[PDB]
Design an enzyme around this catalytic site. Structure first.
Site, PDB file in Angstrom:
ATOM      1  N   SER A 183       0.829  -1.195   0.000  1.00 49.08           N
ATOM      2  CA  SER A 183       0.000   0.000   0.000  1.00 49.08           C
ATOM      3  C   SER A 183       0.863   1.244   0.000  1.00 49.08           C
ATOM      4  O   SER A 183       1.987   1.231   0.473  1.00 49.08           O
ATOM      5  CB  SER A 183      -0.877   0.006   1.299  1.00 49.08           C
ATOM      6  OG  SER A 183      -0.059   0.139   2.517  1.00 49.08           O
ATOM      7  N   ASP A 184       0.326   2.338  -0.501  1.00 46.93           N
ATOM      8  CA  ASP A 184       0.951   3.620  -0.178  1.00 46.93           C
ATOM      9  C   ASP A 184       0.692   3.918   1.385  1.00 46.93           C
ATOM     10  O   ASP A 184      -0.019   3.144   2.058  1.00 46.93           O
ATOM     11  CB  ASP A 184       0.367   4.701  -1.127  1.00 46.93           C
ATOM     12  CG  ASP A 184       1.212   5.935  -1.184  1.00 46.93           C
ATOM     13  OD1 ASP A 184       2.098   6.147  -0.280  1.00 46.93           O
ATOM     14  OD2 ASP A 184       1.086   6.636  -2.219  1.00 46.93           O
ATOM     15  N   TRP A 185       1.355   4.964   1.959  1.00 45.35           N
ATOM     16  CA  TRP A 185       1.541   5.024   3.426  1.00 45.35           C
ATOM     17  C   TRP A 185       0.349   5.741   3.984  1.00 45.35           C
ATOM     18  O   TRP A 185       0.195   6.983   3.792  1.00 45.35           O
ATOM     19  CB  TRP A 185       2.836   5.831   3.689  1.00 45.35           C
ATOM     20  CG  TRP A 185       4.118   5.033   3.821  1.00 45.35           C
ATOM     21  CD1 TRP A 185       5.061   5.216   4.821  1.00 45.35           C
ATOM     22  CD2 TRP A 185       4.665   3.992   2.956  1.00 45.35           C
ATOM     23  NE1 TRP A 185       6.126   4.372   4.646  1.00 45.35           N
ATOM     24  CE2 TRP A 185       5.942   3.651   3.486  1.00 45.35           C
ATOM     25  CE3 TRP A 185       4.267   3.427   1.728  1.00 45.35           C
ATOM     26  CZ2 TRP A 185       6.801   2.650   2.896  1.00 45.35           C
ATOM     27  CZ3 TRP A 185       5.116   2.419   1.111  1.00 45.35           C
ATOM     28  CH2 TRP A 185       6.389   2.070   1.695  1.00 45.35           C
TER      29      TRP A 185
END
Ligand SMILES: *[C@@H]1O[C@H](CO)[C@@H](O[C@@H]2O[C@H](CO)[C@@H](O[C@@H]3O[C@H](CO[C@H]4O[C@H](CO[C@H]5O[C@H](CO)[C@@H](O)[C@H](O)[C@@H]5O[C@H]5O[C@H](CO)[C@@H](O)[C@H](O)[C@@H]5O)[C@@H](O)[C@H](O[C@H]5O[C@H](CO)[C@@H](O)[C@H](O)[C@@H]5O[C@H]5O[C@H](CO)[C@@H](O)[C@H](O)[C@@H]5O)[C@@H]4O)[C@@H](O)[C@H](O[C@H]4O[C@H](CO)[C@@H](O)[C@H](O)[C@@H]4O[C@H]4O[C@H](CO)[C@@H](O)[C@H](O)[C@@H]4O)[C@@H]3O)[C@H](O)[C@H]2NC(C)=O)[C@H](O)[C@H]1NC(C)=O
Ligand SMILES: *[C@@H]1O[C@H](CO)[C@@H](O[C@@H]2O[C@H](CO)[C@@H](O[C@@H]3O[C@H](CO[C@H]4O[C@H](CO)[C@@H](O)[C@H](O)[C@@H]4O)[C@@H](O)[C@H](O[C@H]4O[C@H](CO)[C@@H](O)[C@H](O)[C@@H]4O[C@H]4O[C@H](CO)[C@@H](O)[C@H](O)[C@@H]4O[C@H]4O[C@H](CO)[C@@H](O)[C@H](O)[C@@H]4O)[C@@H]3O)[C@H](O)[C@H]2NC(C)=O)[C@H](O)[C@H]1NC(C)=O
Ligand SMILES: *[C@@H]1O[C@H](CO)[C@@H](O[C@@H]2O[C@H](CO)[C@@H](O[C@@H]3O[C@H](CO[C@H]4O[C@H](CO[C@H]5O[C@H](CO)[C@@H](O)[C@H](O)[C@@H]5O[C@H]5O[C@H](CO)[C@@H](O)[C@H](O)[C@@H]5O)[C@@H](O)[C@H](O)[C@@H]4O)[C@@H](O)[C@H](O[C@H]4O[C@H](CO)[C@@H](O)[C@H](O)[C@@H]4O)[C@@H]3O)[C@H](O)[C@H]2NC(C)=O)[C@H](O)[C@H]1NC(C)=O
Ligand SMILES: *[C@@H]1O[C@H](CO)[C@@H](O[C@@H]2O[C@H](CO)[C@@H](O[C@@H]3O[C@H](CO[C@H]4O[C@H](CO)[C@@H](O)[C@H](O)[C@@H]4O)[C@@H](O)[C@H](O[C@H]4O[C@H](CO)[C@@H](O)[C@H](O)[C@@H]4O)[C@@H]3O)[C@H](O)[C@H]2NC(C)=O)[C@H](O)[C@H]1NC(C)=O
Ligand SMILES: *[C@@H]1O[C@H](CO)[C@@H](O)[C@H](O)[C@H]1NC(C)=O
Ligand SMILES: *[C@@H]1O[C@H](CO)[C@@H](O)[C@H](O)[C@H]1NC(C)=O
Ligand SMILES: OC[C@H]1CNC[C@@H](O)[C@@H]1O
Ligand code: NA
Ligand code: NA
EC number: 3.2.1.21
Lengths: 832, 833
Positions: free
Chosen positions: A258-260
């Site tokens: 995932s992105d953060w």
């Protein structure tokens, strides 16, 4: 509202193509793992808990160190003694497959030598729907063919150097505004969910997905899913983009992280195709995770099938083995969160042993050379009225503009580059690296002039127009530097919240150029910028004798430029986007206001494929500088076009690897000190409900699991899937095209032949780029450029067939030096 | 009120010593001139009427081009394609007579090649009474022996290159505050006349006058008299300083020009020893002159003797011939007032033919090389705890401070250098030139580090302390740049009206250094300044490992400094002034308030000779860095001091006249001449003298306004201290030879600066005074015997009763060593007379 239909089950890896060996090794090791060990591979350990921007705990019993994931697409972020490469948009401006590769290699080497396993780059999403989008400069070009090829070469360079590359952001994250709910709140907007990119199936296949198909086929080991929603389903749990498009149709065998802050559910995302949660917690240092403990529980309680977590672990290990990371492994030998030599081992809560956290390893090698070269070869000469190259004999040189000079806070003096002070060599946000130094245009051009015993000065205050005017009247040549900056949405500079509020030069740039040109009959403009800017106020001024766009050149900026201005390098770069007369000419406006009340703002890509040059050509608008345009110190001729016609239906069942035991096997081990905010795979007790802490635990569970999400039986192979990057028949070569290219001038240099097709039909762009190369010719030298058109190159995506089809409308090919200068053209023969 | 006693008549030239041939040639040509031609030589043509900062009309009938006079002491002002050399204070810091001469030669060559006849420099006044005086930096050192010798070598380099040098400012112009009435009014102060420097006769001979005696003896062609008064008589009509000290006692044979607006009367100045009025008008562009028409009339009406005006002419032509200007003459080939190629010939009124005014002649040759070398050789290493030289292997270098970086307006972006932005390589006012370029410390140091593949950055905003502290924590060495500026009084920067308001670093410098040293254990401080600055707050910080003062280095600043920091040049420079703990330690306060109502402020030099190190030593105060202090990358030992004893007209001629004066009608404006607006001419409107003068005081009590003796053309006595050049030639007899062995006891080649001080003895004499020095290059282990001599002057004091230099009967001692406070060798001197 737009709706995202389900696609389940999440396909499992199968050793496809060049993944066979890495997949066999991954299955052999995953087979030895316990459930808590598998789950350790899938979940980060918490924001700033270890060394790297993202880091998993690894599997120590099996000697697999935690995986260190670090930004950026243009060099190591948050570190020391590393290089700062030119941005991805500069690689796009080179149109040079080999430089894209060599830049990949040099970055891979530096990341590998810091003990980094996974590079968070390169980028091809945003593709560049809007010219004012804040992160286009991290990627390549709004053209999918140009982007897909340079994206793939970048990947291959990084992975050949033994680091996993991460193709990001997947997908449709085409603007910063409203991309995160907490960011929007900080900027004064109340939204319940992030911006939804709403895009039809033909557009996504023909434009935004196409560079991801290239990345996949090139063997990219990881993909990062995006913060925005797509048709109101979050990128990191969007079963259509992840399960259907990426994993079933493009046949992706690696892992999706995932992105953060982009992870929004445990069960939902695991079943919709997510494989890795970063930075591992639900919000930064919340000490809670949608996976870790919760994923171990989801498997023990029967909701997430074992085969799904097993396939996460196999995809993650397979990418790590595919690049050979196991043979290069060392723990990260720096800290992203401090430059101190010593510190507490776990930064955020300051716990664990007090020990060495930085070793100051100088991984730069001679990489300044490839950076200085790639900067010179990405410097687009847009206009040259016989003004360049300079000779060194100019008696008095005026260097004018803050963009020529030093950042008074030091080159790294703005956190994540979040300012536009002094020369612009790197834009802002996560897509950044600490410079080891920064060579300014002032330093390199003054050194060059003093080597010839000339006179030279720099004026770097853009409101000091009295001095500009006085010196411009005295100068043999005025070199005027101007910029326009942008970056990731969590930083705002002068009220530009990541996205650009306009395309006009910053820091009084237009008035500075007019003040110089009003007074010097040889005014040469140099633009550093994240993307196009408006030039209509001055580009045709009679005393503006040349204009160059140098993009974001990284640490050797001033030397890259001087090499071009003084003729050591003959510029070969071409514009990788369109330079329009007005912002309106580009259409594709950003969503800058709430349009769905306090729900998710809705971003309808209603233009379809018609972005950048496809939209200008559709609207019959004339750019000032078209896509593909760039001049040289020599001339080229293209002639002699010749065209020649050339001569599994089901998956396996989902496998399980290894065994899952009782809850009591996964309770925290008793000798272990738990670090505060650290994310673990373990349970407080055999009570599943209590150890999860989830307020929704065990409530309406089956009605929240989409139909098919747990189906491990053999699945149909999609018509357009079955290979890597799509069905292999899409890559059959159907037509060969050749032209002769001659250097008809007096200076060795490079041509960039460009081959466009017209696929035909009422809704198709007039021309679309399909092939290109960069060919070095000495004066009078000629060569034949031959290239081939694949089945994919001549196809359109058919929503009823769910497949690429070569439509019956007649097609044409055009070859020449830009999207607007195509002297050679022919009808293509019918092929299928 | 201090009073300035009269001394008349104004001595006439006589072909003294090296002036014999130039004087014969001047007499021969002035004998052929008409009175209006003679007057043309003495008077400039008006502010900005022609090309040069000052310019006379010349004598076209005898093919004498108008004299072009241009600033500055460190390079051609207001021009193009010229060099910008380091300031005179840096020449002082080199302690190097050869580099002083070479700088004068490279400057004279440039001036000559632009068609300039007279350079307005060098400067030995201000000598440097007060460490905050705004113009000390243009001169050399508060020490008269160091100053006089380097002033002289600078003049010889310029004049050997064929340009007349101008020794300025004569004399006692020791501060900028109240130096001009209209400047004072612009700053809010109402004064009726300029500051008066009031000084006793022994002090002026022993201190301020001494470098001018050296200038005169080295053959300087011109002297520029000052804006201030001396004992309440203006510098440019002070008969005591001009007739008695300069022309009779020192025997000066060249010509005295006024400072610009320092001319305050026609008759009174001509009789008190002025020779040339600059820029020629009474106030800029007033189209009136105290001379020109008025001087022609003053000779016609009997008030100024023809011999006086013929003497002005002969002193002017003799200076011109003496340097061989006639053999290099060309009109000035640039304009000081515009950089345009074409313009009207007469700039201020925009009249005359429209023609080429700029030829853009590149006169720099390879003078960047002597500039580069002289900046390196003037960089004084004040402190070095084994931190320098750098090796090039430093892994991360922080360059910190605005003074490292560029001026964002461009190197020339502040008119007359009137700001302190970016690196300070040149201070402000008339003592300036246009840089051809300026290499900053940031540029040269970042280039050196990149050649070694290091990491490097420059932070140049001195309030960006967060960034400074973060980078300093990461750095191998932090190089912190700080400055303190000043200049001529007509410009104020941040309220400093020429003079400095304090001796504290500008632009937050003390705080910048403390921010770096708090975080970095290898902080190296580099100071660019016009003079000393207070270093007490951080010089002894345990993380401040080296400190350098590099002065005002001119266009090669960053390269000069990198040559030193990286050890291509071993620093040999020595401080030419005292670095004290506090401003109070120097005493000698400027006069900053009216102390005489609205009349001339009074500046009593009540310390007498006790300025700079003589004051510190008298008060038993310990400097942080004493006069003569500088470290090296090697060490030197001094041994073996030995002393060896070694073995004029009484009246002038009568004043001559040369050529003839005729009727008033010979001098009326020629009928076919267009008179240019504001241009100053020597001609009369008509034969009516009163009406042609336009002077409200014409013929008013004239006899009473002509001092006694002022028209006396008869033979005069030769003063006991006069009769030669720079004083009676017996003053220059060598009485004592002194020798000492100097050895390089270290591992690297370098320059030692042996210094020889004397103690003259007596209750009110300084404990030591500098007399001799040299700069000697030695290889590791090499020895050499330094031999010098003391003259009768070197051992004398000025006796006001005798009006002569006298070797007093107090026992004298010699002291040799490496600074005014490190003198390991002493010897008693035997009686000599
Ligand atoms: C042939 O043609 C010639 C060319 O045209 C004709 O030349 C003209 O001759 C006139 C006389 O006929 C001249 O006018 C008079 O000038 C004097 C001198 O003024 C200047 O010097 C002053 C200081 O003088 C001393 O030192 C000089 C040398 O430095 C000597 O030359 C003087 O003799 C005198 O010497 C004594 O003191 C020194 C020590 O200092 C000693 O060592 C000596 O031993 C002697 O003791 C100086 O102070 C003057 O400065 C004023 O003017 C400047 C502008 O020029 C200005 O910047 C200053 O601020 C100052 O301004 C104030 O005064 C002026 C007027 O002078 C006012 O206008 C002004 O507004 C301010 O108040 C200058 O630099 C001058 O002193 C005379 O003026 C005094 O006397 C008249 C009456 O006779 C009074 O009306 C005046 O107020 C003034 O009075 C003061 O002084 C008296 C003492 O004498 C005292 O009694 C009073 O109490 C009072 O305070 C005249 O102005 C004219 O300059 C000259 N023109 C040219 C172009 O050269 C010539 O006439 C003609 N021949 C024939 C036969 O026809
Ligand atoms: C998911 O990934 C996460 C993140 O990576 C994984 O979490 C990590 O797991 C590691 C185990 O693989 C665990 O490592 C422990 O580190 C402790 C702290 O070490 C540091 O401090 C010590 C002490 O000053 C230094 O010596 C050391 O060099 C470090 O600086 C260690 O103390 C632990 O060492 C003990 O276990 C290891 C084997 O793992 C032994 O080799 C070692 O001898 C120690 O053995 C003693 O303790 C164990 C159990 O604690 C006993 O079973 C054994 O018999 C020994 O017992 C004696 O000593 C203890 C006290 O010392 C005493 O009470 C007893 O009575 C006996 O006298 C170990 O090295 C990391 O801390 C952990 N990271 C974090 C942030 O929590 C996680 O495992 C992953 N999960 C999966 C499922 O793969
Ligand atoms: C001796 O003689 C010398 C020479 O004459 C005398 O020196 C003068 O001293 C004055 C008194 O100290 C000085 O005047 C002061 O100047 C201070 C600094 O002004 C400059 O810097 C500030 C701060 O800049 C930071 O912030 C900017 C805006 O955010 C930013 O653009 C800039 O880049 C800097 O950024 C850094 O810091 C910020 C946060 O602070 C970070 O966000 C960033 O990342 C960077 O890290 C700037 O605002 C200003 O415009 C200017 O450029 C002023 O701050 C002083 O003003 C304050 O205090 C006053 C009371 O004293 C009060 O009126 C005022 O309202 C403020 O509170 C003050 O003007 C002067 O500059 C000196 N002149 C010279 C030539 O050196 C000396 O005084 C004499 N000494 C003695 C003993 O007599
Ligand atoms: C004190 O010093 C001043 C300043 O130096 C002298 O004043 C100058 O004197 C010169 C020499 O006399 C004057 O020169 C005259 O200039 C005229 C204009 O010249 C320019 O313009 C014309 C017209 O377009 C051009 O063709 C020419 O080449 C110049 O560019 C000339 O035309 C004069 O020469 C001829 O004219 C006169 C006409 O009256 C005739 O007698 C002759 O035929 C002759 O050939 C002459 O050259 C100059 O103008 C003065 N300058 C100023 C600023 O006024 C003083 O002479 C000097 N005084 C003393 C006593 O020495
Ligand atoms: C697990 O136990 C820890 C430490 O006792 C406690 O802090 C934490 O809240 C528990 N977790 C849950 C979900 O209850
Ligand atoms: C001389 O004549 C000019 C021109 O007529 C006149 O303007 C000037 O004022 C006069 N000078 C004097 C002292 O009268
Ligand atoms: O510029 C001309 C003169 C102005 N007053 C100060 C002098 O030093 C200078 O030469
Ligand atoms: Na114009
Ligand atoms: Na400290």
């Amino acid at each position: 509202l737009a709706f995202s239909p389900p696609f389940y089950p999440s396909p499992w890896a199968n050793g496809q193509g060049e993944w066979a060996e890495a997949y066999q090794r991954a299955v052999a090791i995953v087979s030895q793992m316990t459930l808590d060990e598998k789950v350790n591979l899938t979940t980060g350990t918490g924001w700033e808990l270890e060394k790297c921007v993202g880091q998993t705990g690894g599997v120590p019993r099996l000697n697999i160190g935690g995986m260190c994931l670090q930004d950026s697409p243009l060099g190591i972020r948050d570190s020391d003694y590393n290089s700062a490469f030119p941005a991805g948009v500069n690689v796009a401006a080179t149109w040079d497959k080999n430089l894209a590769y060599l830049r990949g290699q040099a970055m891979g080497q530096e990341f590998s030598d810091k003990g980094i396993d996974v590079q968070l780059g390169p980028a091809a999403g945003p593709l560049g729907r809007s010219p004012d989008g804040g992160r286009n400069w991290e990627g390549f070009s709004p053209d999918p063919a140009l982007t897909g090829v340079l994206f793939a070469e970048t990947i291959k360079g990084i992975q050949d150097a033994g680091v996993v590359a991460t193709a990001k952001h997947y997908i449709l994250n085409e603007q910063e505004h409203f991309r995160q709910v907490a960011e929007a709140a900080g900027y004064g907007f109340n939204i319940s969910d992030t911006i939804s990119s709403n895009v039809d199936d033909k557009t996504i296949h023909e434009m935004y997905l196409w560079p991801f198909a290239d990345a996949v086929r090139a063997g990219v080991g990881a993909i990062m899913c995006s913060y925005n929603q797509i048709n109101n389903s979050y990128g990191c749990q969007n079963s259509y983009t992840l399960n259907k498009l990426l994993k079933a149709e493009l046949g992706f065998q690696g892992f999706v992280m995932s992105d953060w802050g982009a992870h929004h559910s445990g069960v939902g995302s695991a079943l919709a195709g997510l494989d890795m949660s970063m930075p591992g917690d639900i919000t930064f240092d919340s000490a809670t995770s949608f996976w870790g403990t919760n994923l171990t529980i989801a498997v023990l309680n029967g909701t997430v099938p074992q085969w799904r977590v097993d396939d996460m672990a196999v995809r993650i290990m397979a990418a790590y083995y595919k690049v050979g990371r196991d043979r290069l492994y060392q723990p990260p030998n720096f800290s992203s969160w401090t430059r101190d030599e010593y510190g507490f081992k776990y930064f955020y809560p300051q716990e664990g042993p007090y020990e060495k956290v930085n070793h100051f390893v100088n991984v730069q090698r001679n990489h300044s050379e490839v950076i200085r070269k790639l900067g010179a070869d990405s410097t687009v000469l847009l206009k040259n009225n016989n003004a360049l190259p300079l000779t060194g004999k100019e008696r008095k040189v005026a260097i004018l503009g803050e963009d020529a000079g030093s950042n008074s806070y030091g080159a790294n003096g703005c956190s994540d580059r979040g300012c536009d002070n002094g020369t612009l060599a790197m834009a802002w946000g996560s897509g950044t690296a600490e410079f080891p130094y920064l060579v300014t245009p002032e330093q390199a051009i003054q050194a060059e002039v003093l080597k010839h015993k000339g006179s030279v000065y720099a004026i770097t205050d853009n409101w000091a127009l009295s001095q500009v005017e006085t010196l411009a009247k005295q100068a043999s040549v005025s070199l005027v530097f101007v910029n326009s900056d942008a970056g990731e949405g969590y930083i705002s500079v002068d009220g530009n919240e990541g996205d650009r509020n306009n395309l006009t030069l910053w820091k009084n740039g237009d008035n500075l150029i007019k003040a110089a040109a009003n007074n010097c009959n040889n005014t040469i403009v140099v633009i550093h910028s994240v993307g196009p800017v408006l030039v209509d106020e001055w580009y045709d001024h009679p005393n503006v004798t040349a204009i160059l766009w140098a993009g974001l050149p990284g640490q050797e900026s001033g030397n890259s430029l001087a090499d071009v201005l003084y003729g050591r390098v003959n510029p070969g770069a071409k514009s990788p986007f369109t330079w329009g007369k007005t912002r309106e000419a580009y259409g594709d406006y950003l969503v800058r206001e709430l349009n769905n009340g306090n729900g998710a703002p809705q971003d309808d890509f209603s233009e379809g494929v018609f972005i950048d040059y496809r939209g200008f050509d559709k609207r019959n608008e004339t750019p000032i500088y078209e896509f593909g345009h760039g001049l040289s110190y020599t001339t080229f001729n293209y002639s002699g076009l010749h065209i020649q016609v050339l001569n599994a239906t089901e998956t396996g069942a989902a496998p399980t690897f290894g065994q899952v035991g009782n809850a009591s096997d996964y309770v925290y081990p008793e000798g272990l000190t738990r670090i505060s905010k650290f994310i673990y795979p373990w349970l407080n007790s055999t009570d599943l409900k209590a150890s999860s802490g989830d307020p929704y635990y065990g409530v309406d569970t089956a009605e929240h699991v989409p139909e098919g999400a747990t189906d491990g039986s053999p699945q149909p192979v999609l018509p357009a899937g079955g290979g890597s990057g799509g069905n292999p028949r899409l890559y059959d070569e159907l037509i060969r095209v050749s032209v002769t290219v001659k250097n008809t001038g007096r200076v060795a240099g490079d041509a960039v032949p460009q081959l466009y097709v017209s696929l035909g039909g009422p809704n198709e762009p007039k021309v679309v780029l399909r092939k290109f190369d960069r060919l070095t010719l000495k004066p009078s030298e000629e060569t034949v450029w031959t290239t081939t058109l694949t089945r994919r190159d001549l196809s359109n995506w058919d929503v009823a067939a769910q497949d690429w089809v070569i439509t019956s409308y007649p097609k044409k090919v055009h070859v020449g030096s830009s999207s607007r200068q195509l002297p050679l053209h022919a009808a293509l023969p019918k092929v299928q």
